[PDB]
Design a protein around this nucleic acid. Structure first.
Lengths: 101, 71, 217, 25, 56, 221, 132, 129, 83
RNA sequence: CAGAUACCGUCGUAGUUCCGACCAUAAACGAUGCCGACCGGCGAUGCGGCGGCGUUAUUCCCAUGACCCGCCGGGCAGCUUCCGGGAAACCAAAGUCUUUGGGUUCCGGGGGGAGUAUGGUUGCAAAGCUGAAACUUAAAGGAAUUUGGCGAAGGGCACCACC
RNA sequence: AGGUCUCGUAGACCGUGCACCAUGAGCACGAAUCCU
């Protein structure tokens, strides 16, 4: 039977999209189908930032950040605990999980 | 039907004839192969000489054998 | 409903409308509310026509006074805006009140202790009180609702266009509904002001209750 | 058996019977 | 206050079965099962076998 | 064995203020006490069991079987009904189906085939009822034709008082419940159809809840 | 764990509702009260009911409870729902109003009232949150 | 494209009848539509309608009443004789007490009863009951 | 409804909806019958007259019943024509 | 690893790239032919046009760009719905269907044998199109509910489990 | 002139796949209404 209103992707009037490669894997997944995650992180964690700041030449120095985009295949994303299955009536929820912390 | 014009009768007759040939009981009932492969030759009864007797077995639901002859 | 000359909206009622904030409504507009809107303005506020509100209020008052058993009108409010207002309305006109937590099964389940079988139904909001609206469908029972510019109209019969969000406007509608029903019934004279105070129907937060208790005696 | 490999084995049987037919002329 | 009747045996067939008729109130556990319910077990000798009676 | 009405309609019927269920059907009021109809229609209300169909639910310790009962109710000169009830036992399911069938009966109307002489005998027009995949059509017939149907809609039409009908069914008619509910919905549609026999402007008479409210406020709180 | 069951809670709730004046914060005093005003077959049930009565008394002393319908914790709700002020908060000597509302009242039944003053309309026509 | 204007008109009329509207806007008119609506007026199924005269093709606004069950059009125009009308009566009408068949005779567009009265037959147009 | 002799054979005549002219069924519990009170022409008090309207369940569940009651009150003269 | 001419790792030939000439095959899927008409609401989006308070390309005016509030037409789509339909999943079309007829093209009659034999035809080849019969079988399937078991996920428990 | 600006401090989102893991003999199953 048909499971979703769409087909697990974001293609409506195209028919073909360019494929991308997974990051945890090497599967050729289409670009609008793959679960994308733009993650931003600092170079240091919250424990080592004091150790970096106490051993710095420049006082009041801003620590740089690391920018990377991740492309995941479906099995790779569900096996890395990025997205999981949910209820039939809860599958139509479009909003992301809340950004409380 | 699909053709609903006032002058659409040849197309309806040809389509009905094609879909009638594209069937099962009309297909066995109108070729000569299904009656030629019939050993009775389009007959209700037939005669013949018995050669031997064979005990043919039943299917998987039930356990018995069936007494039979070859004609 | 307002066709006579004695049934006209007087001088003080327009002042109560302008002081209670009745004439202005919400941001969205329901397509059943195209005729009860004067126009739109800046910052996305629709203007409710006060004369059509008066006509619908007189129509609802006529429908209430038309039956002769005052206990057969059931009035439900489950939001905190109209808790005490429907209680004062039921004390004034003799109706039967429900104030919060309308149990699903009063009008339909016949073996319950709260099995109610009235003839006319008044509710203060069509959207938040969706439970009495669908329950009123299983019996031959009309419904009068205090409807906003964005409240959906389903299973309603007399829609009074008002601002059902502020407590002042809601208390003003319940007070004038009781006033008009008592005027049609003959208990209240039509020319002498029976006006006690309109604030007996008004809901307030409890912080204002200790504020008034501290500021008063 | 899935239909893909049964079609592949069927095509191999087509090739064998075609070779035998064309070499038995 | 309430009762249940259990009849077990070869009830209309070769394989035995049991029918239970529970309605009312019936406690099962603790000290008050001793002096609130009354339990009797009897055996019926019919032409096909033995039928038991459990009444409480 | 006594009547204690929990509704004001049942109390009003018990107090001999409502002459018949004609005005109850006219004002479209729901009937929730099944013995109001048993008071109005007494010994002239026959019934018989259509089919007892067992249903089972799979659990950890085998199957829990349950019996569902179908019964037809109605007088042979008018109203007819149908009720479905499932329980653990057969007799409990049958009596619950009898109560649920007598609780919900509908009036049928009868017409003529051509000339309007004598009493009406057949279905006045072509009505259709559908539930599931089953379609049931009721076609008027001349006098003395009889019911040309399957046995279950034939017995439903005889218990509804219709003497003549032509029928034509489509779908999986092997399921008795869907077939019976389909012909019940077909025969219940005889009053929802608008005919030119009634186009005059109706007058809305007063409801019993308005007419007898002074009696009701004294007989009950 | 020590969680009271529904029988203890219902018995303590109807004890608080029905006999309220002859109670207190002492466990032994309302223990003897619950001994005499009711019939409890055992003693552990009596002690648990008396303890929940003491806890409910300590809870009533701070405020109302939505399971209990005693006399003393209401009627100040009744006085609070029936106190009537002096100033109406609707009979104002001046009332601000919108220009289109002024034009609407112009068309309705009036030409001019000596109560209203008109405010300027907003120069910015932004009212919706940025959602996209 | 638009090939049967009368079928479209009765389809719009039936759709707005099932919806519950009181006025129906038919965009293309014809003389056949005028005669059909005149027959439906004279047998009392529709109300008082209009012809919106512009210079290309007029529009028709029909005042509706709740007396109409269905309006249908038989396509194409089958020729029917007087002995073949009863076949259409049994397989097209819901009953014999009411229901009418509009057919195009040489004496004008009329119903089946007037066609039997004037002793003539013609081509099929539609039905209403 | 009648026969050749002249008597009526239908056991009851059902109501029709005043807003859509559809027959209200026997089991249609969503249908209503609202009574509207008529007022005295001088004093402005209820005298004992009623104005009755029947709306079927389809119009009521469609959400277009309040304007139907308003139109019926306008055509009866309850709600004033200028509105 | 029992076996591993498989998963895994290191190399690696045709191929992957371009030109010139071939085949016409995909879950080529919206698994849903094309044209035309009608039947609810709402918020956005891409294009073109129209109207209107205000801000900006620094302070005045006009037009153009950029914002804001709306209307119109075409298009990819979304939310809700006792319109209506359906076996249901679901669909504003898969609706206007026993109250059955707007016009028109292709195509299917239980499951296998079988896209198989043969004949014709196209191609250098691989293969593409057309396409049976004998025989055999009482089921093969579609939607949905309950249990059950997942080297499925999320919460808790047990010294007949562990540390 | 005062010399610790004001109100509480989720301030854990360290991370990635995860060795080998096959098979199961069938006989043992019956579908229901009402009182004298």
């Amino acid at each position: 039977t048909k499971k979703r209103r769409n087909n697990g992707r974001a293609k409506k009037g195209r028919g073909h999209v360019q494929p991308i490669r997974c990051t945890n894997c090497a599967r050729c997944v289409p670009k609008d189908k793959a679960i994308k995650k733009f993650v931003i992180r600092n170079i240091v964690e919250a424990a080592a930032v004091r150790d970096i700041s106490e051993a710095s030449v420049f006082d009041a120095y801003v620590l740089p950040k690391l920018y990377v985009k991740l492309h995941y295949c479906v099995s790779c994303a569900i096996h890395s605990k990025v997205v999981r299955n949910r209820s039939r009536e809860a599958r139509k929820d479009r909003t992301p999980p809340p950004r409380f912390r | 039907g699909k053709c609903r014009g006032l002058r659409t009768a040849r197309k309806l007759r040809s389509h009905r004839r094609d879909q009638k040939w594209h069937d099962k009981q009309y297909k066995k009932a109108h070729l000569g192969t299904a009656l030629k492969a019939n050993p009775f030759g389009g007959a209700s009864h037939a005669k013949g000489i018995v050669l031997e007797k064979v005990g043919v077995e039943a299917k998987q639901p039930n356990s018995a054998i069936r007494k039979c002859v070859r004609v | 409903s307002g066709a006579l000359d004695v049934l006209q909206m007087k001088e003080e009622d327009v002042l109560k409308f302008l002081a209670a904030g009745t004439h202005l409504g919400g941001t969205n507009l329901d397509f059943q509310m195209e005729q009860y809107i004067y126009k739109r303005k800046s910052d996305g506020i629709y203007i409710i026509n006060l004369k059509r509100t008066w006509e619908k209020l007189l129509l609802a008052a006529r429908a209430i006074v038309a039956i002769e058993n005052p206990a057969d009108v059931s009035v439900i409010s489950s939001r905190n805006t109209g808790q005490r207002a429907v209680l004062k309305f039921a004390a004034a006109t003799g109706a039967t009140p429900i104030a919060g937590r309308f149990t699903p099964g009063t009008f339909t389940n016949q073996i319950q202790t709260a099995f109610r079988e009235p003839r006319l139904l008044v509710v203060t909001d069509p959207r938040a009180d969706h439970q009495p609206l669908t329950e009123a469908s299983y019996v031959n029972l009309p419904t009068i609702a205090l409807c906003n510019t964005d409240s959906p109209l389903r299973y309603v019969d007399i829609a009074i266009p008002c601002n059902n969000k502020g407590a002042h406007s809601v208390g003003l509608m319940w007070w004038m509904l009781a006033r008009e029903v008592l005027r049609m019934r003959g208990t209240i004279s039509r020319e002498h002001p029976w006006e006690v105070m309109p604030d007996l129907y008004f809901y307030r937060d409890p912080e204002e209750i200790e504020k008034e208790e501290q500021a008063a005696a | 058996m899935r239909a893909k490999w049964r079609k592949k084995r069927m095509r191999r049987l087509k090739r064998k019977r075609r070779k035998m037919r064309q070499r038995s002329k | 206050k309430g009762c249940e009747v259990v009849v077990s045996g070869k009830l209309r067939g070769q394989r035995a079965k049991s029918m239970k008729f529970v309605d009312g109130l019936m406690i099962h556990s603790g000290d008050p099962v001793n002096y609130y319910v009354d339990t009797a077990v009897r055996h019926v000798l019919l032409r096909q076998g033995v039928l038991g009676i459990k009444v409480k | 064995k006594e009547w204690l009405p929990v509704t004001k309609l049942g109390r009003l019927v018990k107090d001999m203020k409502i002459k018949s269920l004609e005005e109850i059907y006219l004002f479209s009021l729901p009937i929730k006490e099944s013995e109001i109809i048993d008071f109005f229609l007494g010994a002239s209300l026959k019934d018989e069991v259509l089919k007892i169909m067992p249903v089972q639910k799979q659990t950890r310790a085998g199957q829990r079987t349950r019996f569902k009962a179908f019964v037809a109710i109605g007088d042979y000169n008018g109203h007819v009904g149908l009720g479905v009830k499932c329980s653990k036992e057969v007799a409990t399911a049958i009596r619950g189906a009898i109560i649920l069938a007598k609780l919900s009966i509908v009036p049928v109307r009868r017409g003529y085939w051509g000339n309007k002489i004598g009493k009406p005998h057949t279905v006045p027009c072509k009505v259709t009822g559908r539930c599931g995949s089953v379609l049931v059509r009721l076609i008027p017939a001349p006098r003395g034709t009889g019911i040309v149907s399957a046995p279950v809609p034939k017995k439903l039409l005889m218990m509804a008082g219709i003497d003549d009908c032509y029928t034509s069914a489509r779908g999986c008619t092997a399921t008795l419940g869907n077939f019976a509910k389909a012909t019940f919905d077909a025969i219940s549609k005889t009053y929802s159809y608008l005919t030119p026999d009634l186009w005059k402007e109706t007058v809305f008479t007063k409801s019993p809840y308005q007419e007898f409210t002074d009696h009701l406020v004294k007989t009950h709180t | 764990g020590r969680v009271r069951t529904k029988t203890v809670k219902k018995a303590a709730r109807v004890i608080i509702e029905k006999y309220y004046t002859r109670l207190g914060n002492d466990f032994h005093t309302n223990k003897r009260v619950c001994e005499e005003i009711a019939i409890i077959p055992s003693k552990k049930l009596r002690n648990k009911i008396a303890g929940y009565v003491t806890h409910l008394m300590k809870r009533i002393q701070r405020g109302p409870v939505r399971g209990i319908s005693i006399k003393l914790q209401e009627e100040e709700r009744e006085r609070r729902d029936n106190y009537v002020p002096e100033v109406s908060a609707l009979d104002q000597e001046i009332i601000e109003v919108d220009p289109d509302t002024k034009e609407m009242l112009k068309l309705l039944d009036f030409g001019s009232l000596s109560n209203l003053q008109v405010t300027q309309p907003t120069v910015g026509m932004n009212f919706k949150t940025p959602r996209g | 494209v638009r090939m049967n204007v009368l079928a479209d008109a009765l389809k719009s009329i039936n759709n707005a009848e099932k919806r519950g509207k009181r006025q129906v806007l038919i965009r293309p008119c014809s003389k056949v539509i005028v005669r059909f609506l005149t027959v439906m007026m004279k047998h009392g199924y529709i109300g008082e309608f209009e012809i919106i005269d512009d210079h290309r093709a007029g529009k028709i606004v029909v005042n509706l009443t709740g007396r109409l069950n269905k309006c249908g059009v038989i396509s194409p125009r089958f020729d029917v004789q007087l002995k073949d009308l009863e076949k259409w009566q049994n397989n097209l009408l819901p009953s014999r007490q009411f229901g009418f068949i509009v057919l195009t005779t040489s004496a004008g567009i009329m119903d089946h009863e007037e066609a039997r009265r004037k002793h003539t037959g013609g081509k099929i147009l539609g039905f209403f009951f | 409804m009648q026969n050749d002799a002249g008597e009526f054979v239908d056991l009851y005549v059902p109501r029709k909806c005043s807003a859509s002219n559809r027959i209200i069924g026997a089991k249609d519990h969503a249908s209503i019958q609202m009574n509207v009170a008529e007022v005295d022409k001088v004093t402005g008090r209820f005298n004992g007259q009623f104005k009755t309207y029947a709306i079927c369940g389809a119009i009521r569940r469609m959400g277009e019943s309040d304007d139907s009651i308003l139109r019926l009150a306008k055509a009866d003269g309850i709600v004033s024509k200028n509105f």
